[PDB]
Ligand SMILES: C[C@@H](O)[C@@H](O)c1cnc2nc(N)[nH]c(=O)c2n1
Ligand SMILES: C[C@@H](O)[C@@H](O)c1cnc2nc(N)[nH]c(=O)c2n1
Ligand SMILES: C[C@@H](O)[C@@H](O)c1cnc2nc(N)[nH]c(=O)c2n1
Ligand SMILES: C[C@@H](O)[C@@H](O)c1cnc2nc(N)[nH]c(=O)c2n1
Ligand SMILES: C[C@@H](O)[C@@H](O)c1cnc2nc(N)[nH]c(=O)c2n1
Ligand SMILES: C[C@@H](O)[C@@H](O)c1cnc2nc(N)[nH]c(=O)c2n1
Ligand SMILES: [Zn+2]
Ligand SMILES: [Zn+2]
Ligand SMILES: [Zn+2]
Ligand SMILES: [Zn+2]
Ligand SMILES: [Zn+2]
């Protein structure tokens with residue numbers, strides 16, 4: 198078994214609407230978000246790879262454009278943009294064009310994140 | 316499933332008591348230790364998260380104050396303070412208060428660590 | 434000569450109001466900003482330090498709290514919140530309470546920043 | 552169960568022979584490679600570890616010396632030196648001298664790599 | 670005084686011609702090179718910046734393309750491609766187009782590097 | 788002007804003898820300490836360098852061996868081993884064997900350090 202992964206970062210704004218009154222996350226703020234796409238599958242004997250890294254980047258690119266330098270709450274499905282909802286949403290957007298996807302990781306900060314799978 | 320993780324670092328001294336005579340780990344020394352706490356669970360449809368990262372941080376804290384800026388060998392159960400032993404010890408202290416705990420990782424140095432699960 | 438520094442991270446939203454329209458920075462977005470404060474001065478023979486790292490952390494606190502998990506455009510003096518303007522703005526808030534401040538570095542992203550001095 | 556891991560970096564050149572003529576990986580180039588060896592086993596009740604980190608390092612050394620500061624295409628088995636092939640290859644060199652080995656990870660760049668377990 | 674900086678990484682092979690016979694840098698190998706371009710200048714009142722990060726990026730591009738996924742020794746002026754020689758050579762390419770340039774840093778590996786300032 | 792730099796890390800214990808009664812630094816503890824040595828001089832036309840990175844690693848080794856996996860307080864001159872004192876102390880050990888030394892930086896934690904320059 199072989200797993201490949203590629204990391205991306207994007208700069209965005211968000212706010213959490215269902216947190217308690219005066220919770221710091223309920224104010225408009227932002228992060229440099231780290232996402233990791235992980236894919237599992239067979240290695241081709243000839244090319245020596247599961248899929249070209251550049252090909253994983255290209256598949257993620259339209260989702261990436263929509264996230265980077267944007268305000269996440271304005272994206273349908275992200276109206277509650279926690280790390281967990283974000284990772285599921287990314288899975289849902291990318292799984293159909295990367296059928297070998299087996300994990301998506303979202304880090305909001307250098308110290309805290311989330312991993313979504315199947 | 317969805318996993319959450321939060322990272323902490325604490326600064327401590329320790330010594331390994333059972334290593335051979337010349338061994339550098341037998342001398343009083345210290346490290347910047349890194350701990351990752353991992354938990355696995357259901358995402359609440361309303362809050363959009365498993366628990367607040369800050370809840371996690373708050374639960375580890377009593378344990379954190381005991382490790383940070385201390386000499387590990389003086390803590391009961393850490394009298395042989397390897398990473399393997401520390402990881403299990405941290406699991407035993409934190410699992411009772413975070414039942415969703417699914418792994419603890421401890422890194423002594425930037426290049427070396429271990430993961431205790433179940 | 435001896436210089437000390439301490440690093441801080443805060444999560445915030447901002448947008449640049451004087452970019453041509455269509456410029457990515459003109460949209461509401463965010464970053465995990467890193468700030469480095471740098472002081473220069475005489476080491477006390479008794480304490481062995483210039484001042485305590487925690488004293489530096491404490492003098493920065495009221496400024497830190499205005500920036501962390503906030504929208505920077507709403508802070509007066511920050512209506513054009515570029516890295517350059519922000520480093521100056523922080524200098525200006527922090528120099529009165531830390532007279533040995535010799536530099537302020539602001540990093541918007543992991544790959545890009547600014548340093549302000551004197 | 553408990554898992555131990557150890558990280559190494561080696562500096563190397565390589566080119567991919569089976570990419571289309573345009574492709575940038577077909578040019579002679581290089582990377583600071585990162586490799587992680589992962590072992591899973593029983594923690595000895597006296598030593599308090601699975602095996603010494605230093606032992607894992609000493610076992611990887613001969614493989615390490617072949618990789619470091621070398622051109623990978625000249626190494627038998629690495630004539631198509633992708634991340635995937637490197638992972639499996641390292642697995643193959645290392646599993647016989649470290650039977651606890653449970654994963655090998657190779658990172659070609661900071662944001663991209665691959666995990667192998669047989 | 671304000672300084673701004675921007676980091677880039679590129680993947681390249683090289684080798685050193687003037688080291689003694691068994692020296693490891695004399696073998697064909699590679700690295701993930703890191704370069705930091707630094708500029709110093711006045712902050713414009715309207716833009717709030719010295720120049721856009723993206724402008725510094727665009728000026729460096731023709732030079733960056735020559736370096737990434739290439740063999741350094743084949744580039745004229747880089748037949749002895751040490752960090753020191755690389756740093757000066759980048760300065761020499763970029764300085765004429767970016768007169769505000771005040772420093773070029775190169776790092777071959779995570780822990781070693783060089784800074785050229787004219 | 789050209790400057791070259793090399794980073795090292797060592798694992799050590801210390802405590803601060805001159806902090807008030809309850810100060811956490813006054814307890815026995817430890818750090819992964821990072822040290823950067825910086826040197827400044829002329830690049831030899833033939834070697835393409837100031838000195839070999841490995842040469843600087845060799846000049847620092849006897850001093851490095853005294854710090855790594857050791858209790859700093861028992862080293863003469865380090866009875867009060869703050870970052871400031873340690874950076875001056877390392878300068879003092881390293882200057883006589885590296886006349887081109889222009890800076891020593893010491894970092895105790897990931898986010899706080901000291902730079903001493905003569
Ligand atoms: C910035 C941070 O306060 C906010 O983004 C936040 C706070 N707590 C959180 N907690 C969880 N579990 N998930 C999150 O995304 C999350 N997010
Ligand atoms: C500093 C380091 O030598 C010492 O803490 C050390 C050395 N070797 C080790 N080896 C293992 N397996 N686990 C450890 O915690 C460990 N720990
Ligand atoms: C998001 C980022 O592109 C935007 O914040 C941005 C773009 N270019 C920039 N350029 C400079 N010089 N300073 C900035 O703060 C800056 N900031
Ligand atoms: C340099 C880099 O472009 C080249 O080494 C490259 C490109 N795409 C890749 N894609 C995969 N899947 N694996 C690789 O090792 C890989 N390797
Ligand atoms: C990779 C490394 O072994 C080799 O490239 C190397 C070794 N020692 C060096 N020493 C100096 N000063 N500069 C270098 O670029 C340098 N470069
Ligand atoms: C571990 C940390 O609490 C302790 O070593 C500490 C605390 N505050 C400090 N403050 C200064 N200025 N220098 C130090 O070395 C220092 N060192
Ligand atoms: Zn947030
Ligand atoms: Zn140790
Ligand atoms: Zn921005
Ligand atoms: Zn490559
Ligand atoms: Zn090299």
Ligand SMILES: [Zn+2]
Pocket residue numbers: 801812816817818895
């Ligand atoms: Zn300390």
